[PDB]
Design a protein around this ligand. Structure first.
Ligand SMILES: CC(C)(C)c1cc(O)ccc1O
Ligand SMILES: CC(C)(C)c1cc(O)ccc1O
Ligand SMILES: CC(C)(C)c1cc(O)ccc1O
Lengths: 318, 172, 318, 172, 172, 317
C-alpha cells in the first residue's frame, strides 16, 4: 500500500483583471483600487477652518465692499469663493489682481488695524451712490476717498513708520475721472499723481482721464495697488491729487492658508482633503477627482482606475 | 511566473480550498482529505500586506499652490502655469502606471515562489520515501495513515520510520 | 545500453549590448531601439493643417503688413515661421509680444470682421512711406491711423458692444512721434492719450516723444496693444491723440492650434508628429530629435540610444 | 540570471539551433540529433511581446505648449521657462533609463526561468529512469531509441515502460 | 527571498565565517572544518558592485537656475517658482524612495539566489552518493576524508569512485 | 561511516536596517548611504572661479558703488553674495531687479568698455554727499550724472553704433528729485524725460517729483534701466532733463556662470558641487543639504537617509 499527497493553491470564481510588466490584463484572485474617483460632493468643515465667501470675493472683502462687511477681521484656512459673488461698490480694477488675491489668501487673515493718518487740507470720507452703505452714499470701508478742501488740494505728504516686529500690508488706490471737469471739481489740479514708497520700493501712478463702460452710474474707475512695509522701514504717501488713501494696514501672517473656487456646499464632517468637487478620502495614493486640491490629498493622476493585485494568479479548474 | 508552479507544473488551482492560500489533498487507506498550510498562506499574506502598507502610507500635504483654471486668455505666464501642471500630472501618471505594473508582476512572482517553497519543503521531508509524479503530487511509497499525513503537514514526519518499507516498494 | 539527453538554448554570432540593473553592458540575443533619433528633414502636410508663413511672422500677418496680405483670414493647425521673415511696414513694438504671438497662435485663425467705427472730427486712413502698398503710402490693413482734421483733434469716444456668443480680439495701438513738433502737427494736443476699456478691464497708455534710430526712414514708432471683449461686454475707446484705431475684431477659437519656428521644407506625407527638424515617426516611446514638438510625439529624452532586450542572454559556442 | 541555467549550469548556447530558443540534443544507440522545444520557445516569446507592446503603446499628444528657444536675454521669466523644460527632460530621461534597466534585467531572468522550467519539466517526466549529470544533461539509464527520445520531447514518455530496466542499470 | 534558502531552509548564518559570503562546514573521519566558497561569494559581490556603480554613476551638472528663496512676498510668479521647485523635489524624492526599494528587494533576492545556486551545484556533483537532510546539509553515504571534502568544494569530485560504497550504505 | 557537508552563508553581529518593496525595516549585513547629509561648511575655491562679493551685491558692483570699485572688470563662475553686503551711494531702485541680477550673473563678467559719448551743453560728472569717494562728493563709477550747464539744459540727443560682433549691455538711469526747487535748479525744465531706443526697442521714462524716505541725507531717488544693443544696431539716447547716462557698455558672455547667496567661508580645496552651506562631495546620487546648488551635484531630496543594501539578508545565530 501507498498514499498520495498533492500540493496546491486556492482559486476564486470572481477574479480581478490587473496589469503587469508583461500583460495588459491578467486575472488575479483579488485586488485593491489605488485611484480615488468619487466625492461626497460636499466640503467637510473639519479639520480645516473653512470660510464661505458667499456673495463676496476675497478682494471685495479685503477692500470692504459694504455687502462684504461681515468679513472684516476674518480668518480662514481655506477661503471658498462662490461663482455667485458680485461686486457692488465703486468700479475698480486691480492691476495684477491674481497676485493680490494670492498673497492675501496665503496670509489667511483680513485683520485690519486703523492708524492715525493726518490729511492736512483735504476733505475725507468721500462716498458714492455706486457704493451705498445703508440708504445714502458710501465707500470701501478700508479706503478713504480724499477730495479738495476749500478750493485747494495741496501736495499731501504723509508718513507712517513700521515699528512692530511684523510686516504691514497697505492697500491704496488712485482715481481715474471720466471728464476733465470731474478731475478739477474734485482735486483742483488738472493732472494728479500718487507716489507711495519705502526704503526698498517706490510706485508712481498717474491718473488717466476718460470714459469707461457704465457701471452703477459711473464712467470713471479706481485702480487698486498695494505696498508691504517691513519692520524698521517707513511708508511715505505723497500725492498732489487723486489719492484713494488707506485707513491703516492688514496684518500679514504665514501658514497653511489658501483660497479655492467651488460651488460645493459646506457640511459638518471630517476630511483632510478638499477639492472643488467636495472633500475626498485620502486612503488611496492617487486620485482622479480634481487637479485642484487643498490639504493631505492623493496625487492627481490621469487614470480612473489602477488595480493593485493582493492575491495570486487565479486559475480555476472550472 | 518565474517558478513554474502556479499555472505551471501545478495544472490549476482549487476553487474548493476556502480556508487557506495553500495546502494539501491526500489519499491513504483511511480515505481522502484536504487541509490548508497556514505557514505558507501566512508568508504570502504578510508580504502582500507589507507591499500594500507601503503604497497606502504617507499622503503628503499641500496648501497654497498655483491656480490651475483660468477665466480668460492671458498668454505667456498662463501658458507656463498650464505647462507646469500638465507636466506634473503626466509624470505622476507614469509613476502610478509603472508602480502597479512592477508591484503586480512581483506579487504574482512571490506567490508563485511561495507555492514552490512549500513543494520543496515537503519533498525534503519525504527524503527517499516518496517520488514526485510531476503534477504537484507525491506518491508516498508506504502505508501512511491520517497521523502520518498530519505529520508531513506539520513538519515532524520521520522518514526513518518508513524508509525500509518505502525503499522496498520503490525498488524491489 | 543507455542514452544522453541534453537541454540547451540558442545563441547567435552577433549579440547586442544592453543595460541592466547590475550591468552597464551585457550581451543579449536581440534588442530593439526605443529612442527615435532620425528625421526625414521634412514637415508632412498631413494630417495637420500646416500654414507656411513664408516671409511673414504671425504678428505681421495679424497686423496686416502689405507683403503679408496673402494671409488675411487664414487658418492653421501649425503656423510655421521662417527665419527669412521680415517686417516691411510702419516700425513697431509690442509690449509682451510673446503673449500676443501665443494667444493668436493658439486661436488658430486670422478671421477678421470689419466693424463700423465712426471717428468724428478726425482724418482717417493715415499712411506712410515706410509701408508702401504698390505705388505710394500705406499702413497695416487692420489698423486705422487717425490724425487731426482742420487743426483740431477732438476727444474721440466710441463704443462697440459685443452682442455675439464668442470672444472678440481687438488689436490697436498708439503712435510715438519723434519730436514735439511732429506731435502737434499730427494731433494738435501737446500730449495724447489712449484708454481702451471693457466693463471689467482697462488699459491706458500715454505716448512717448523722442528721437530714435531710422527704420525705413522713420524715427517714429507705433506700439501694439490688444483687448478681448467677452459676449455681453462692451469696448470703449477714448483718445485725444495718437490713437491707432482698430478696424474691427478677430474671431477667437480654442483648439489644437499652435506655432513653430522651422526652416524645414513642407512635403506631402502623413506624420502625426512634427518637430522643427521635420516630421518623425512615433512608434518608439522616446525621441532625441528635438525638445520642441507638435502632435502625437515620443517623449523627449537626453539619451541618443536605449536598447530594450528582446531575447535571452547571448552566450556563444565560440 | 536568478535561476542559474543560462550562463550558469548550462555552459553555453547553441548557434546551430535556428528553429527555436530552447531545445534538445541527444545521443542514443540509434545515432544523434537535435530538435527545438516549441512550448517553451513560445512561452518566452509571448512574454517579451507582452513587455514590448506595453512600452510601444500610447504616445500622448501635445499641441500648444511653451517656447523653448529664445533669441534674446530677458531674465526671470525666461529662466523659469528654461528650468521647467530642463526639469521635465531630466525626469523623463531618468524614467527611460530606469525603464530599460528593469525591463532588461527582467527579460534575462525570465528567459533564464523558461530554460530552468524546461529542464525541470523534463526531469519530472523521467522519474527514476535518468540521472542528472549537472550540466543540463540527463544520463538516461535504458535503451532509448529515436521514438523513445521523441516521446520525451513531446511529453508522452511513459516512465513505467522502462522503470525496471533503468533501476537495474542504475543500482546493482 | 524568492528562493527559500537564506532565512529559509538554511536556518541561519555563520558569524564564524569571515573569509567569504557562502561556504561549507563539514564533519568526517578527520574531524570538523569550515571553508568559504569563492566563486559564489564573487558572483554576489560582482553583481552588487554592478548595481552600486550604476547608481553612483555621474550626477548631472547645473549652473544658472531659478531662485529658490525669497525675501519679499510677491504673488503669482513667486508662487510659480516655488511650485516648480516643490514639484521637482517631490518627483525626485519619489524616485529615490522607489529606487532603493526595488534595488534592495532585488539585492536580497539575488543573494538568496546565489546561496541556492551553490546548494544545487553541490547536490548535482554528489549525484547518487548523498541525500539532502533538508537543512542545508548533505549526508554523504561514504567514507570521505579532507581530500574528498575539498574535491567537492572545488568541483573535481568523482561520483563514480564512491558510487558502490555509497549505494550500499544507502540501500542495504 | 558517512560524512556531513553543510552549506551556509555568513552573518554579522550588527546589521543595517534597509527598506524594500515589502518591508519598512529589514536587516541586511551591509548598506551604503545614498543621501549626502553633511557639509564641511566651506565653499571650495576649486575648480570653479568663486568670486567673493564681500561687502557688495553684484548690482552695486555693476553700478560701481565706490566701495565696490574693486569689482571693476571682475569675472566669476559663481558670484557669492553675503548677507552683510550694503549699499553706500546714491539711493536707487531697479524695476525688475531680479532680472538684471540674473542676466548679469549669467553673463559672468563685469568687463566694461568706456565710450566717447559727447554731452554738449550739460555739466558732466555730478556727485553727491550720499555717495563719497575719498574726501568729498562722488557717484556710481559707471554712470554719469548730467546737470545744467550755464543755466540751460539743451535737449540731449546722442548716438552710439554697435559695430562689434557681440551684444553690448548698457546700464542707465533717471533721477527722481524730491521737489521742483531741486528739479528746476538741476535741469531747468520743470518736467524731465529720458528716451533710450535701438532699432529693435524703445523706453521712455518720466521723472516723478515727490519725496521718499530719507536715505543717506536724500529723499530723492535714481531709477535704473538696461538696454541690450545687438551687432549692427545703434543706441540713441534722447533727453531734456534728469538723465543718468551710461559711460559705456558691459560685454555679455554666455557660459556656466551664476550667483549664490551664502555666508559660508571660502577655503582652498577641490569640490565640484557648491551649496549655500558649503561644498559637498558628489559620490552619492542624492543630497539633503540644500535645494540651492551650483555645479555637478547630487539631486536634492526630502529624505535624510536612504540606505542601499550591499549584502544579503542578515540572519544571526
Ligand atoms: C508598461 C509601462 C509600465 C512602461 C507604462 C505604459 C504606459 O502607457 C504609461 C506608463 C507606463 O509606465
Ligand atoms: C541604473 C539607474 C537606473 C539607477 C540610472 C542610471 C543613470 O545613469 C541615470 C538614471 C538612472 O535611473
Ligand atoms: C514603496 C514606494 C517605493 C512606492 C514608496 C513609498 C512612499 O511612502 C513614498 C514613495 C514611494 O515610492
Amino acid at each position: 500500500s501507498t498514499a498520495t499527497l498533492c500540493l496546491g493553491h486556492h482559486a476564486v470564481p470572481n477574479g480581478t483583471l490587473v496589469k503587469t510588466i508583461t500583460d495588459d490584463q491578467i486575472e488575479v484572485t483579488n485586488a485593491t483600487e489605488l485611484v480615488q474617483s468619487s466625492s461626497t460632493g460636499k466640503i467637510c468643515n473639519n479639520p480645516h477652518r473653512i470660510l464661505d465667501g458667499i456673495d463676496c470675493t476675497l478682494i471685495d472683502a479685503l477692500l470692504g465692499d459694504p455687502h462684504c462687511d461681515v468679513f472684516q477681521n476674518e480668518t480662514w484656512d481655506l477661503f471658498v469663493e462662490r461663482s455667485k459673488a458680485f461686486s457692488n461698490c465703486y468700479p475698480y480694477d486691480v492691476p495684477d489682481y491674481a497676485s493680490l488675491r494670492s498673497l492675501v489668501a496665503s496670509s489667511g487673515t483680513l485683520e485690519f488695524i486703523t492708524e492715525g493718518f493726518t490729511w492736512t487740507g483735504v476733505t475725507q470720507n468721500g462716498g458714492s451712490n455706486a457704493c451705498k452703505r445703508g440708504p445714502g452714499s458710501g465707500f470701501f470701508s478700508r479706503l478713504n476717498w480724499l477730495t479738495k478742501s476749500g478750493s485747494t488740494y495741496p501736495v499731501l505728504n504723509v508718513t507712517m513708520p513700521n515699528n512692530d516686529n511684523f510686516d504691514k500690508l497697505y492697500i491704496w488706490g488712485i482715481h481715474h475721472p471720466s471728464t476733465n471737469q470731474e478731475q478739477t471739481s474734485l482735486y483742483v489740479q488738472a493732472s494728479g499723481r500718487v507716489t507711495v514708497s519705502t526704503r526698498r520700493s517706490q510706485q508712481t501712478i498717474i491718473p488717466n482721464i476718460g470714459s469707461r463702460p457704465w457701471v452703477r452710474g459711473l464712467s470713471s474707475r479706481i485702480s487698486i495697488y498695494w505696498t508691504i512695509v517691513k519692520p524698521g522701514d517707513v511708508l511715505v504717501i505723497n500725492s498732489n491729487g487723486n489719492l484713494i488713501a488707506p485707513r491703516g494696514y492688514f496684518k500679514m501672517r504665514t501658514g497653511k492658508s489658501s483660497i479655492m473656487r467651488s460651488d460645493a456646499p459646506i457640511d459638518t464632517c471630517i476630511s483632510e482633503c478638499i477639492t472643488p468637487n467636495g472633500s475626498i478620502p485620502n486612503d488611496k495614493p492617487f486620485q482622479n477627482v480634481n487637479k485642484i486640491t487643498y490639504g493631505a490629498c492623493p496625487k492627481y493622476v490621469k487614470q480612473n482606475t489602477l488595480k493593485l493585485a493582493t492575491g495570486m494568479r487565479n486559475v480555476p479548474e472550472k | 511566473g518565474l517558478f513554474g508552479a502556479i499555472a505551471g507544473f501545478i495544472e490549476n488551482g482549487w476553487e474548493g480550498m476556502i480556508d487557506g492560500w495553500y495546502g494539501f489533498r491526500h489519499q491513504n487507506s483511511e480515505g481522502t482529505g484536504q487541509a490548508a498550510d497556514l505557514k505558507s498562506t501566512q508568508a504570502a499574506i504578510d508580504q502582500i500586506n507589507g507591499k500594500l502598507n507601503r503604497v497606502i502610507e504617507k499622503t503628503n500635504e499641500k496648501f497654497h499652490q498655483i491656480e490651475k483654471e483660468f477665466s480668460e486668455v492671458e498668454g505667456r505666464i498662463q501658458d507656463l502655469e498650464k505647462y507646469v501642471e500638465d507636466t506634473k500630472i503626466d509624470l505622476w501618471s507614469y509613476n502610478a502606471e509603472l508602480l502597479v505594473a512592477l508591484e503586480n508582476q512581483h506579487t504574482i512572482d512571490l506567490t508563485d515562489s511561495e507555492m514552490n517553497k512549500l513543494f520543496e519543503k515537503t519533498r525534503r521531508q519525504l527524503r527517499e520515501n516518496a517520488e514526485e509524479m510531476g503534477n504537484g503530487c507525491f506518491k508516498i511509497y508506504h502505508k501512511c495513515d491520517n497521523a502520518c499525513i498530519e505529520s508531513i503537514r506539520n513538519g515532524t514526519y520521520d522518514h526513518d520510520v518508513y524508509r525500509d518499507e518505502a525503499l522496498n516498494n520503490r525498488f524491489q
